[model samples]
Target: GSSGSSGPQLVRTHEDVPGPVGHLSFSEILDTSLKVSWQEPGEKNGILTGYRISWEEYNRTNTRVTHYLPNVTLEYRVTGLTALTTYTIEVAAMTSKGQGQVSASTISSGVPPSGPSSG
Candidate 1:
């Protein structure tokens, strides 16, 4: 009863996790919204798990919004913003381990690109 059934065990570790997105840029700007796109890291060490996005007014110091999404996602739409305000945004990659480094960034605001109103 002292010695239980000892079985063989295997050990494995992953060290090639993917890096952060290479770059983050803004496009398709509108009065109260914009679109963001990014480039995957040069060395996608491993399968991408997700993406974390954050944005804030260029003049704000303590107000921002963040979003997290699954892998292979390269674009997102930001809405419900002030009409004449400029904002900055950033993107980061994630894996099973955790989030990777942050990508470049973007700051833009202008008139709608042939857009409309909500109501």
Candidate 2:
């Protein structure tokens, strides 16, 4: 599914990152933040140097918004999010070398100041 090595020889990870399928996961959804985590494929010693996480929010017009991107982080404390509103988010991983593959995004939600969902 990539450019080179098109014959499907044998592969596990992409760009040294684990399959984006579920490499990215999140929790701790709060009024203004969420916890994020990811995994990388086997490397020299099965230990990756680290990761580079990123995210962005898409506006209704399909254009990107700064608010969403700026708040993106591995363990984000996202702020300035709308209350009880739905928002889309994107995530990716990176190694010391650079960004790897784009991971599946986890939608983020902001709780109203009143706390918890009414429904």
Candidate 3:
């Protein structure tokens, strides 16, 4: 007689997606665009729908964003960001199960190029 495989059911998909590159640095954060990316999560064969994006302003409360992507694995160039200020970014993967996970705890943060010096 033998028992069934009572192992981890991958219930914590959220934890793993954001784990691979949660504490990793962003690829780019320019004045006109921000290239934030992470290494793919390689665990038990699962499906990842997309990525979630959230940001922490340099001088304001954290804003809510919901346009992140995960179709492909690479650098994500974000536009319409403030110039010369440090903007914190949060990136994570979302499974078909539901929404994904993101947090300021991520290491993907950067300061865009200051357009011009303020007088």
Candidate 4:
């Protein structure tokens, strides 16, 4: 004789879109590069698959560049920018469901030096 017992059934479901990233900031501003970093979303909702980082010239259209990052990545250096130009950077979290809201920050690049001033 044998006895069969069923304990409990566990069900897992995918989570909804996550919340926006937090503490978005920029540093190390140079003529053509800058460092940007952020913290993970307060409400991740689920396991974070990746992140999407994008930037564009402030008040300019059709000049945006986007990059994808692993879940572990929290900082990136943006390059190929013009001197004294203002850029708007955006960061968004992504899960299995889809991407979440974006957090943005703006910074201007370093200004170039001018020629020697006249006496």
Candidate 5:
């Protein structure tokens, strides 16, 4: 005979936390601006409430730009970047509990997506 009941569904507890976002990408890169996009994690252990995005000049790491968005957002346009310099970007998801780990990427402010020096 089969077991009395298959099993109970698993659930998150107070100790649960969100994982990283996925598919972080760049589009429409130009001399002064760029578009960034990403998707929610497959294992969003809790209700995602927002995101934390931070960027900095690769050569001037001391100065940083940061932004926050509600759960309703998934894309952002960064502007006022130096014309021919490299910038580093990072993204992380958040829940009522706290922030998650980040996905990091780099882009040259005025270079095309394919313009980065290849390995």
Candidate 6:
């Protein structure tokens, strides 16, 4: 049986991936670990699912490692690093669609030997 016309239906579409995180910072520098934190992206195209954190020895090759976060978080602690060595760290937001652009920062393991020695 024929019926009256129904109202137009609207569908919600997923937007592009999120943008880069903001205010990337590092702290708690230890002999082999450090804490990194950042603010949420200014342009979150969609609901954020998680984040991706990766790091590597600065200006080096074959030392990159990637880490995945299962939920939304603002901070992370990176471990297993060489003392006095600098690492290039990156953070990216993730959405249902995919990973977004990354924000980068550098930090060095600054713990010196237990004994006090001359420079």
For TM-score, the strongest prediction is 4
Clashes of 5: 0
Off by over 4 Å in 5: 1-15, 111-119
Deviating ranges (above 4 Å) for candidate 6? 1-15, 113-119
Model 2 is weakest, by summed lDDT over 10 consecutive residues, at 63-72
- lDDT per prediction? 0.69, 0.44, 0.52, 0.77, 0.73, 0.76
TM-score per candidate:
0.70, 0.49, 0.55, 0.77, 0.74, 0.76
Rank the candidate models, highest TM-score first. 4, 6, 5, 1, 3, 2
Q: Write the number of the candidate with greater TM-score, choosing between 1 and 3.
A: 1
Q: Write the per-residue lDDT of candidate 3 for residues 35-63, one digit (tens) a residue.
A: 66654544313576766666555545544
Better of 1 and 4 by TM-score: 4
Weakest 10 consecutive residues, lDDT, candidate 6? Answer: 2-11
Model 2 ranges with Cα > 4 A deviation: 1-22, 42-47, 60-76, 115-119
> What digit string (tens of lDDT, one per residue) describes model 1 on residues 3-89?
323332322244455555656778887777888888666445667788888877776746578799888787898886656677778
lDDT of 4 by residue, 1-119 (tens): 32323431322245378766766788887777888898787657888898898877887748788899988897899888778998888888888877877778887887644444523
Each candidate's clash count: 0, 0, 0, 0, 0, 0
lDDT of each residue in 6-118, candidate 5, tens digit only: 33234434545666576578888786788888877654668988988887777676857889988767678888777778887777888888887666688887653445674
Quote model 4's TM-score: 0.77
Of the pair 4 and 5, which is ahead by TM-score?
Answer: 4
Clashing pairs in 3: none
lDDT of 3: 0.52
Q: Which of the predicted structures, 3 or 4, would earn the higher lDDT when compared with the native?
A: 4
Which pairs of residues clash in candidate 6, taking residues 3 or more apart in a chain or in different chains? none
- What is candidate 2's lDDT per residue for 24-112, written digit by digit as tens? 56666665556655443333123334444444443442422322222123444444445454555544444445444445464646465
Q: After superposing candidate 3 on the true structure, give the runs of residues whose Cα lies further than 4 Å from its correct spot.
A: 1-24, 42-45, 59-64, 103-119
